[PDB]
Design a protein around this ligand. Structure first.
Ligand SMILES: [Mg+2]
Ligand SMILES: [Mg+2]
Ligand SMILES: [Mg+2]
Ligand SMILES: [Mg+2]
Ligand SMILES: [Mg+2]
Ligand SMILES: [Mg+2]
Ligand SMILES: [Mg+2]
Ligand SMILES: [Mg+2]
Ligand SMILES: [Mg+2]
Ligand SMILES: [Mg+2]
Ligand SMILES: [Mg+2]
Ligand SMILES: [Mg+2]
Ligand SMILES: [Mg+2]
Ligand SMILES: [Mg+2]
Ligand SMILES: [Mg+2]
Ligand SMILES: [Mg+2]
Ligand SMILES: [Mg+2]
Ligand SMILES: [Mg+2]
Ligand SMILES: [Mg+2]
Ligand SMILES: [Mg+2]
Ligand SMILES: [Mg+2]
Ligand SMILES: [Mg+2]
Ligand SMILES: [Mg+2]
Ligand SMILES: [Mg+2]
Ligand SMILES: [Mg+2]
Ligand SMILES: [Mg+2]
Ligand SMILES: [Mg+2]
Ligand SMILES: [Mg+2]
Ligand SMILES: [Mg+2]
Ligand SMILES: [Mg+2]
Ligand SMILES: [Mg+2]
Ligand SMILES: [Mg+2]
Ligand SMILES: [Mg+2]
Ligand SMILES: [Mg+2]
Ligand SMILES: [Mg+2]
Ligand SMILES: [Mg+2]
Ligand SMILES: [Mg+2]
Ligand SMILES: [Mg+2]
Ligand SMILES: [Mg+2]
Ligand SMILES: [Mg+2]
Ligand SMILES: [Mg+2]
Ligand SMILES: [Mg+2]
Ligand SMILES: [Mg+2]
Ligand SMILES: [Mg+2]
Ligand SMILES: [Mg+2]
Ligand SMILES: [Mg+2]
Ligand SMILES: [Mg+2]
Ligand SMILES: [Zn+2]
Lengths: 208, 151, 138, 237
RNA sequence: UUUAUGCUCU
RNA sequence: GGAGCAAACCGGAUUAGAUACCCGGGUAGUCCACGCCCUAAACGAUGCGCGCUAGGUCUCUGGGUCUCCUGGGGGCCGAAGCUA
RNA sequence: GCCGCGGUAAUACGGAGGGCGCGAGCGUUACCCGGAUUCACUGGGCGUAAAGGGCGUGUAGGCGGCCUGGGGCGUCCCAUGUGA
């Protein structure tokens, strides 16, 4: 299925702290604090003027890695974004963000995108009252994201819900902290998000 | 203030009694992404020296690039030597579609939306000189009417 | 002899503008004027006037060029950068109204003969007709 | 005053080049008799008018003019008429690049200074008898070519050419630099590439002295106080 | 007015 | 029909060989009539017709109010443009 | 796969560590289209790159000067039927 195993090799192969971690990629070691270079035996050697293709590849990998998604799915969406009328570039990002496993992370129900994924695929999530265990369910302006019933306990939740007090969630979102529930209000504008990504190069990638 | 992206570095070689004598050539693009570009081709006995004087000439050859929302006014087709470039304007929200050579230029001059195709000779040197002349020939409804009126 | 009188004209012009002549005579014709007419109305020529060479009907056409430029090759731009027959005698070209061209994204004219006279791309789209597509100019 | 009457322009200043022409010289031609093309002087006036209308303007704003005349008929009539206006000129061979390569051609002028500032000074006699004649010989020719070019340590904003054909190099040389080109030209050359034209005889001292002289005057009038006639009727005929 | 020829891969 | 020339062929030289190059001979053929053959670097390696786009000079051949103009050919240099 | 690697220091062979790309799939072979404006209607050519017929005469065919009417075949417009 989705990728598994070593992650800090990505935190740092793309060469940009991208917070695939929980609280660690925040500590004085996303692994990227200690060793800010590519993994493996050659990470400490002098880089070569990258190939025009290489740059578009690394970028695509970066973004695609952030959401921890499979290329099978990652392009499923890019093609959708292409067809759909819009700015294509930013349209794409909206679709990636509209994912359940991503929302649940943006709403801080869980710390990591991967923690947020297991949370959905276990029943510890509910949409508009219904049980929803599909890390791909696309949410639209108006839905009621929320923690389930039998799941209102579990130190994991309230421990992570607490650390949410102080943090202001992005515009397109909202959260009733005390009640455990958010709402997908709108489709996140480009400006609304500052991904370390140049989405232009990701489009220039699939234009073979 | 300016931006330098070079597309071509190559090693030519003359011939003299006892060995081949080399020399280098660099194609450099110079722009501001605000509507100004320049193409310079410099050659020197070593890579950097040539790259350097490339930019030199690069600014010795500029051009108005009448943008229109990161695109161009009309569609234009231009030929240099046996090489040919087709510039068709795309609607904002598309992207710059071109090869490595025509892209580097169209980018360091603004243009974030444009459709293009190289025809005839895909030779880099000549395709570039053809793309500049292709921009150098663009006209807007403004300069269009400043032509057709009388007096 | 001449197979295409119209094309010939357009070419006579294309050749004068290249050497920057003030004008050029072209064997006259009713239809050949209607077109020459539209070239002045759209400001591609200063206009024309019926004349008589050796007692034969002609049409002096007064060309327009841009201002003397500076730097090497100090030669004016061109009011008529481009002009060529579409529909030829060897291959007639007829387009329905929905099928009308778009010369240089509106920046250029697209003369074309319709059952309501010699019109232009827009001028014809206004009437909403279409017909034989004489030539394109910019 | 400034102007000229078609009276004095009756010496020999209306034609010279027969069927040796440049057909682009249409507007400025009247009729071919005695084989030779006789150039219409009436239009010479109109252009001589419009021409000065740029010279005078340029003069009374401190603009410089560079003189080029390598012909035989138009050599001396420049060395004087130029200095008499405190302007730079070219008398002998026209070194290629002088403008497009002013940067490096000048480095050869600083040498002139450095040679002048070594005539009879605290160091010369210390140098061998062999090198002396040598160093001074490098000066002799050094000044021969760069005498009039010496002035102006910066490229001008116009040049005055005796024959845009004999000096095709310069005309285009400057033309590439956006440097306005003004010249005297008979049927030898073509207009088009001249910015301010003086359509008249470019051979025969008579015309080169008449039209170039009272042209140097119109310069000082916009400068300050036109003097009296200057070196002209030398070995004149 | 006498000459012809130069193994294989770099 | 056949003088000169000359594939083939013979001889003399040359050469390692010399069925070649050079030399001496020499038959078809080269020539004419008639009838076939249909090839070619059959070349400007550039199909034909018509209109349009500076000129300079040399030449052949017409007409001219015979310094020059005009028409049709044959060459060179060349505007603009074309061309790897 | 194409250019090409191996001749005792091989990033090109074999294994290894490491890395890159995809992931219940990953490769391979075969075939179609694309890139190929490389059959060019859009959108190519023919002096020397492949390409002007050895030259004429001419059949069918293709194309065809200026002006004015008639017809309305092409063409254009609208309406409508059909286009499951
Ligand atoms: Mg889109
Ligand atoms: Mg595509
Ligand atoms: Mg071509
Ligand atoms: Mg090719
Ligand atoms: Mg190639
Ligand atoms: Mg042998
Ligand atoms: Mg050998
Ligand atoms: Mg052997
Ligand atoms: Mg081998
Ligand atoms: Mg023998
Ligand atoms: Mg023997
Ligand atoms: Mg023996
Ligand atoms: Mg031999
Ligand atoms: Mg014999
Ligand atoms: Mg014999
Ligand atoms: Mg036989
Ligand atoms: Mg045959
Ligand atoms: Mg022959
Ligand atoms: Mg051939
Ligand atoms: Mg021919
Ligand atoms: Mg034929
Ligand atoms: Mg004759
Ligand atoms: Mg006669
Ligand atoms: Mg002739
Ligand atoms: Mg020639
Ligand atoms: Mg030329
Ligand atoms: Mg070993
Ligand atoms: Mg080894
Ligand atoms: Mg080795
Ligand atoms: Mg390999
Ligand atoms: Mg290996
Ligand atoms: Mg490994
Ligand atoms: Mg491994
Ligand atoms: Mg498979
Ligand atoms: Mg075609
Ligand atoms: Mg081809
Ligand atoms: Mg042809
Ligand atoms: Mg051959
Ligand atoms: Mg032939
Ligand atoms: Mg042939
Ligand atoms: Mg034939
Ligand atoms: Mg025939
Ligand atoms: Mg017939
Ligand atoms: Mg007809
Ligand atoms: Mg017919
Ligand atoms: Mg009729
Ligand atoms: Mg219907
Ligand atoms: Zn980390």
């Amino acid at each position: 299925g989705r990728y598994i195993g070593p992650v800090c090799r990505l935190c740092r192969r793309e060469g940009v702290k991208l917070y695939l971690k929980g609280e660690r990629c925040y500590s004085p070691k996303c692994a990227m604090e200690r060793r800010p270079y590519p993994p493996g035996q050659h990470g400490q050697k002098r880089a070569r003027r990258p190939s025009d293709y290489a740059v578009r590849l690394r970028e695509k990998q970066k973004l695609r890695r952030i959401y921890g998604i499979s290329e099978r799915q990652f392009r499923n969406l890019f093609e959708e974004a292409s067809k759909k009328k819009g700015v294509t570039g930013s349209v794409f990002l909206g679709l990636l963000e509209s994912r359940l496993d991503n929302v649940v992370y943006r709403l801080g129900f869980a710390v990591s995108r991967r923690q947020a994924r297991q949370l959905v695929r276990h029943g510890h999530i509910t949409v508009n009252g219904r049980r929803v265990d599909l890390p791909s369910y696309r949410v639209r302006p108006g839905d009621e994201i929320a923690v389930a019933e039998k799941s209102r306990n579990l130190e994991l939740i309230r421990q992570n819900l607490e650390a949410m007090k102080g943090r202001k969630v992005g515009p397109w979102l909202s959260l009733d902290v005390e009640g455990m529930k958010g709402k997908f209000l709108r489709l996140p504008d480009r400006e609304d998000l500052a991904l370390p990504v140049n989405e232009q190069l990701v489009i220039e990638f699939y234009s073979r | 203030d300016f931006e330098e992206k070079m597309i071509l570095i190559r090693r030519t070689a003359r011939m003299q009694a006892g060995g081949r004598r080399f020399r280098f050539g660099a194609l450099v693009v110079v722009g501001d992404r605000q509507g100004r570009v320049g193409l310079g081709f410099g050659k020197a006995p070593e890579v950097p020296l040539a790259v350097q004087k490339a930019g030199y000439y690069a600014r010795r050859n500029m051009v108005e690039v009448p943008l229109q929302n990161g695109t161009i006014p009309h569609e234009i087709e231009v030929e240099f030597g046996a090489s040919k470039i087709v510039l068709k304007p795309a609607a904002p929200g598309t992207g710059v579609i071109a090869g490595a050579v025509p892209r580097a230029i169209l980018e360091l001059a603004g243009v974030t939306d444009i459709l293009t195709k190289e025809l005839g000779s895909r030779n880099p040197i000549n395709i570039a000189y053809a793309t500049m002349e292709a921009l150098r020939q663009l006209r807007t409804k403004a300069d269009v009417e400043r032509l057709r009126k009388g007096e | 002899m001449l197979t295409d009188p119209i094309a010939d004209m357009l070419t006579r012009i294309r050749n004068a503008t290249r050497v920057y002549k003030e004008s050029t005579d072209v064997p006259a014709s009713r239809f050949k004027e209607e077109i020459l007419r539209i070239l002045a109305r759209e400001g591609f020529i200063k206009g024309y006037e019926r004349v008589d060479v050796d007692g034969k009907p002609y049409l002096r056409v007064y060309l327009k060029y841009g201002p003397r430029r500076q730097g090497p090759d100090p030669r004016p731009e061109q009011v008529i950068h481009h002009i060529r027959r579409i529909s030829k005698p060897g291959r007639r070209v007829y387009v329905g109204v929905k099928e009308i061209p778009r010369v240089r994204r509106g920046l250029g004219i697209a003369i074309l003969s319709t059952s309501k006279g010699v019109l232009t791309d827009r001028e014809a789209r206004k009437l909403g007709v279409g017909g034989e597509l004489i030539c394109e100019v910019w | 005053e400034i102007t000229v009457k078609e009276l004095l322009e009756a010496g020999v200043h209306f034609g010279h080049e027969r069927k040796r022409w440049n057909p682009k010289f249409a507007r400025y031609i009247y009729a071919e008799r005695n084989g030779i093309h006789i150039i219409d002087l009436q239009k010479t006036m109109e252009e001589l008018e419009r021409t000065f209308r740029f010279i005078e303007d340029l003069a009374m704003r401190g603009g410089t003019i560079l003189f080029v005349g390598t012909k035989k008929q138009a050599q001396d009539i420049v060395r004087m008429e130029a200095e008499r206006a405190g302007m730079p000129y070219v008398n002998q061979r026209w070194l290629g690049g002088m403008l497009t390569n002013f940067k490096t051609i000048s480095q050869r002028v600083h040498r002139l200074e450095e040679l002048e500032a070594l005539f009879a000074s605290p160091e010369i006699e210390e140098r061998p008898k062999k090198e002396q004649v040598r160093l001074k010989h490098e000066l002799e020719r050094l000044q021969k070519y760069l005498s009039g070019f010496r002035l102006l340590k910066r490229l001008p904003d116009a040049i005055f050419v005796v024959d845009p054909t004999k000096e095709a190099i310069a005309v285009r040389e400057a033309r590439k630099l956006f440097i306005p080109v003004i010249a005297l030209a008979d049927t030898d050359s073509d207009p088009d590439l001249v910015d301010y034209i003086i359509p008249g005889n470019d051979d025969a001292i008579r015309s080169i002295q008449l039209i170039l002289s009272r042209a140097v005057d119109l310069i000082i009038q916009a400068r300050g106080g036109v003097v009296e006639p200057s070196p002209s009727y030398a070995l004149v005929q």
